[PDB]
Design a protein around this nucleic acid. Structure first.
Lengths: 129, 150, 142
RNA sequence: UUCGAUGGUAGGAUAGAGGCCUACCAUGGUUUUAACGGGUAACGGGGAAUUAGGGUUCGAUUCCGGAGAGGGAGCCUGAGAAACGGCUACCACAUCCAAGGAAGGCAGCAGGCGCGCAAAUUACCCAAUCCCGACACGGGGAGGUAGUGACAAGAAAUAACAAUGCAGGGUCUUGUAAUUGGAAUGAGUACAAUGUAAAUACCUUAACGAGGAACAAUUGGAGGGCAAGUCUGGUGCCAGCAGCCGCGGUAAUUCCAGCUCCAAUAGCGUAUAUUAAAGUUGUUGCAGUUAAAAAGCUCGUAGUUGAACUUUGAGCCUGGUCACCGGGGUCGUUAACCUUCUGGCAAAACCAGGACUUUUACCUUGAAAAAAUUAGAGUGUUCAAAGCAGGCAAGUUUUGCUCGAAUACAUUAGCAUGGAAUAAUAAAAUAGGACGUGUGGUUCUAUUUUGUUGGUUUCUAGGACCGCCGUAAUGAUUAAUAGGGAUAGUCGGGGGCAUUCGUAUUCAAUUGUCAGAGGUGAAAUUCUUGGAUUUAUUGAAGACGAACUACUGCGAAAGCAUUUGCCAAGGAUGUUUUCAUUAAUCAAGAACGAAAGUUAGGGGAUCGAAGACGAUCAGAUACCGUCGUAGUCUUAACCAUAAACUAUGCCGACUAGGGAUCGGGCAAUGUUUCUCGACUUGCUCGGCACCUUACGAGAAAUCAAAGUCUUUGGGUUCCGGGGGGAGUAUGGUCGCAAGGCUGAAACUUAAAGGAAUUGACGGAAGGGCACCACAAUGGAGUGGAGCCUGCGGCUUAAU
RNA sequence: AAGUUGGACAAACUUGGUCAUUUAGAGGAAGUAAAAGUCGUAACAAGGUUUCCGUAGGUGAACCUGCGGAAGGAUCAUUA
RNA sequence: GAAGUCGGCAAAAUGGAUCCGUAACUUCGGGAUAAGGAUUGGCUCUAAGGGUUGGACAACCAACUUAGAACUGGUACGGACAAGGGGAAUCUGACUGUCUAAUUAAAACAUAGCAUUGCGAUGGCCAGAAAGUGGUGUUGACGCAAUGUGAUU
């Protein structure tokens, strides 16, 4: 049984990027996936993506523009405080300037840098770079 | 994956994107309800009647026209069976296997199949008890399984 | 593989505790072998009473007489073996000399080609070693 | 759970709550989220050690709390003790003794014996801190001061100033100097002044105060790891080293002596316990096809994990630091702070204020909370370990002034504020719902007045409740390439029962015939002129389903192959069929579980454990041939394992090219057949597989999974931590038993093990080549008799 | 006041049983470090009877044989 | 306190009931009343457990038990009577049962279990002098007849 659709979406994206394909199809769709895709698209790692709206959970077609080395999920979603962001960045991110950690804080789903600016922690969703 | 098998079949039905009755199908949303009530008065299965309206009557998915499910329509009209359809069918199959087992004493494969059916019927009964579709005290009985099916 | 649930701490802790006994280091440290089965009681050094001297044969590929000594511990009375570092001092170390023993380095394993030796003489008769070989200090009268 | 374990009633006792105790009444309370029992080589914490992060070990010890004064027990005084530098009784110690007796407790400060690897003076003082008391004054082995130690920490003395032939270098500059002179001299010796209760030490300080024994700095190593010897004498696989490899059988760089150098330096080394190494305990972060390890398979409970969706989009301004960002909100689309109570306003709600989480986890922040410790702010103990002090002012030496003594670490757990992303339970389905200046009523309280007190009525302010009353849009998320249940054509060597057929094997009768038949590489045993073997007819027995039988099918696995009938069931496919999360994984717990083995009954043809004979080699005792026991068959009860294999757990998603193959479905104005079937082609779903490739993985063999893993996290069970000992002993448990499940320790070893490569070997195969190989009717011979010559045995003195 | 009758606290002593540890104990059955000898492939090649697993019997010794399995075999192969 | 004796022969000791507790071994059924401990009288009470019956109840009549408490005396009480001694091993027979009336009660016999033999009736076994004779046999191999061994493993 599908335990987390976000893991499947990110695994499909990274698999397509390794294969070199410029488009990828993700099934099913969810608000968490849409928020995650918005975060990486705002950061510039993801081109336009269209949500096919059938009478089901939905499907997403994403245009991949390269410049992604690895995108993954952190399961289980550990609760991350303000002081734990540095530890997570050191553990996951390649450096202090490259890579993004996505946290579902109280103010919504956003990057670790934006959450640090918000001065609010939350739960770790995943990472991409 | 299959609940009690190694198969991975995906055969199902793909409901159309449209949610409206066909142009010529002027089912008027009340003659169908009367037909469903008549088909339930005899005591046919809700799935079986829905098949009959799909094939013989030519009616589309009944929800798209009547606005309510087959189970919901008959429950609203009062023709609600004492037990759910899947619950009753599994008890029927379990009763038949036990009646075959009491005659054929050397069928270990049938005994194993009966054990699988007993596991399935208990899990379904537990779900229905939790959801409240049945009285809280609905302990399944092996000796009175004939009572439960009929 | 291993469970990765947010509430799987009990399962992870129980598995780690159960499997921790497989390691020899943890098993030794928690079974108290350094006190019960060991000739000492975790002591770094101890005193003993000499019993005799043995020229234990050397295993392959060597063959030698290592002039080791059989000693009886003062605190327990058990009989163990000891090694003499300096050369030709067998005449110097006699029996019932109130010898002082310490370990060898492998924390309870035989050294080199001589099986059954884990302790070496540090001091003998209270005069110590490294002096009776250079004739810096002589043995006292007994 | 008695003789109190759970709760209730009543009582006693306690300063007070209380099964603390008593009498009665019910049987209760904890527990796989580990109750109970056992070990602790266990006082707990602040804290200490190691230090990427995470973690691991320790805490007897300067502070806080607990217990104790040899072991318990009892009690007086006293606010406060079950006090022991108070007492009483008993036990184990030791003690003076006129043998009648008294009697004692250093785990308090010094000191003594013993156990010990291991730890100091029977010193001085109440001067500083504080404590007690009747008290400005007394006492304090608390505490301070000193004395001995090898170590716990912080700072530096063993020196440097020149001439010196030469190696030189470049007239500039180091070197040993069998050499000297002048320089800077600091520890000590000793009266001073400070210091101190008095002293020790410290800073200043009468003066004396180094030329080589100066006033000699050592500990380990020099094959590698890890730094530094094919330098010289002695032994010679011995003595011995040697943490490991390894060296030592006359050239010893590793043994012991001289010399030199190397790392550290008043320190070096050794032993043990721990940490890093160890990504060899793996949450971060291991591994399970072959190196250690996927349970024989399936069901399934605690536990873990759990498809998508419910206020979102756009337009604003606003005060603010880096044209962005954080934040505050209506305006309204779409309803504007849901709601409870109150103030004024009054045609309720409209405005504002108090509470607003149903209930959270989660995040932020705040309150509250020992110091010491750590990080760290400031400050010149001459620096530093330190300490919490300090600073002005260099012309009057100033009847004073000026800073500080921060800050963080806190959240484990508890209280509180703000947010509602993520993840959880309910909202109104038999409407058993917000319904409300509400159509009618009950019932109570007086928060009040009717005269202060007591009582009924009820106007009144309020809690609660009884049949209705349509205020309104009255109420059910899609139905997951999740799942279950139907339904149609099927499909299957899937299961059970009954039933049909087949020849083969053996045996029995009779018939034709006579010499051998069987068997092996060769035999041998046995039977056969009494009719062997063979052949012809009939009958019986049990076993088994050849050929078709396939890199084909079914079943959860073990396994399933003659026909037919019945019963129950199963996957896949088709489906605008039904319910709607009903799901995955499993500790425990149960079903099935080859063959062999067990208990009995029936049955027992062939084969065949054990066994019986005959070659076989030296011995065969085993392979071989014949016979032949248990067994192989079935029925009813057992067990519970195998190379039970795909040496590869289950569920979900993604990942490349081809052709075969089974089941289903879709299409063919394609072929064929007396309405459908057979063949062919294309598409799709679900299986068994095959070939190529390796983006990718691995140690490689290899792998479409063993890939998507240092770029390490989808969910979940089982299992391993070098090899032996050993799946052994013991313990528990299932079985009538064999045995099954669970399952160590001591001791020992420096290696076992996997993959692959090169040689070697094979009573392995395939190509060949050879009179030192054979075939050839081979020719000649040696060896057979006797002699030359040489080799061992013998003799001698040397032979 | 000594003494005395009852109640509880009850130290401590006798008799027995249970638990943990230790010391015994002749002797019996194991492996490891092992004086010469002993010993044939049981296994490493087709190890000379292919190997191995489960089960049962027999044998001084590895072991032999019966039944069912696996290749970890010495065969990935017979479409005619 | 068995030193007696071949030998605990004989005797003594235990003994009922209630409440605790009970090992090795085992065929799981036992051993077991294992072993080992405590109490028991009289009197006065307390509590609980059942029947019909006059208007939540009820004054009777007709009833027996159990458990507990205080007090008391010869620290005694199944006060006579009644009434198990127990344990650790070896040989042997499995057990219940049977026999030498009048010296041997046993390890002897029998037993269930196990195994063998004959017989399909024109027969097996037995009987009778014979018989137109009898038994097994009102029987038919799950039967009858004849033997050996002696539970289970």
């Amino acid at each position: 049984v599908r335990q987390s659709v976000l893991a499947d979406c990110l695994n499909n994206i990274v698999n397509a990027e390794r294969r070199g394909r410029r488009q990828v199809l993700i099934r099913p769709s969810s608000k968490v996936i849409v928020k995650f895709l918005t975060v990486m698209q705002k950061h510039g790692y993801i081109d336009e993506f269209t949500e096919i709206d059938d009478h089901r959970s939905g499907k997403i077609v994403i245009q991949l523009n390269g410049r992604i080395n690895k995108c993954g999920v952190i399961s289980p979603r550990f609760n991350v405080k303000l002081k734990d962001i540095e530890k997570w960045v050191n553990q996951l991110l390649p450096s202090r300037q490259v890579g993004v950690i996505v946290l579902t804080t109280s103010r919504g789903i956003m990057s670790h840098n934006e959450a640090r600016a918000k001065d609010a922690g939350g739960k770790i969703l995943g990472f991409f770079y | 994956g299959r609940m009690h098998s190694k198969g991975k079949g995906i055969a199902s039905s793909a409901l159309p994107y449209v949610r409206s009755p066909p142009a010529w199908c002027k089912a008027d949303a009340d003659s169908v309800v009367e037909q469903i009530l008549k088909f339930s008065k005899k005591g046919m299965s809700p799935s079986q009647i829905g098949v009959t309206l799909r094939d013989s009557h030519g009616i589309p998915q009944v929800r798209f026209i009547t606005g309510q499910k087959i189970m919901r329509i008959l429950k609203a009209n009062g023709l609600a069976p004492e037990l759910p359809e899947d619950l009753y069918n599994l008890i029927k199959k379990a009763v038949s296997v036990r009646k075959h087992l009491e005659r054929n004493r050397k069928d270990k494969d049938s005994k194993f199949r009966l054990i699988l059916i007993e596991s399935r019927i208990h899990r379904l009964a537990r779900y229905y008890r939790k959801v409240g579709a049945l009285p809280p005290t609905w302990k399944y009985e092996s000796a009175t399984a004939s009572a439960l099916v009929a | 593989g291993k469970p990765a649930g947010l509430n799987a701490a009990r399962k992870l802790r129980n598995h780690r505790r159960e499997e921790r006994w497989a390691d020899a280091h943890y098993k030794k440290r928690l079974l108290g072998t350094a006190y019960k089965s060991s000739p000492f009681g975790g002591s770094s050094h101890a005193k003993g009473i000499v019993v005799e001297k043995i020229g234990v044969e050397a295993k392959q590929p060597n063959s030698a007489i290592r002039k080791c000594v059989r000693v009886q511990l003062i605190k327990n009375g058990k009989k163990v073996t000891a090694f003499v570092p300096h050369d030709g001092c067998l005449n110097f170390v006699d029996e019932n000399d109130e010898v002082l023993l310490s370990g060898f380095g492998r924390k309870g394993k035989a050294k080199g080609d001589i099986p059954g030796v884990r302790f070496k003489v540090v001091k003998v008769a209270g005069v110590g070693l490294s002096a009776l070989f250079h004739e810096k200090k002589e043995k006292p009268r007994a």
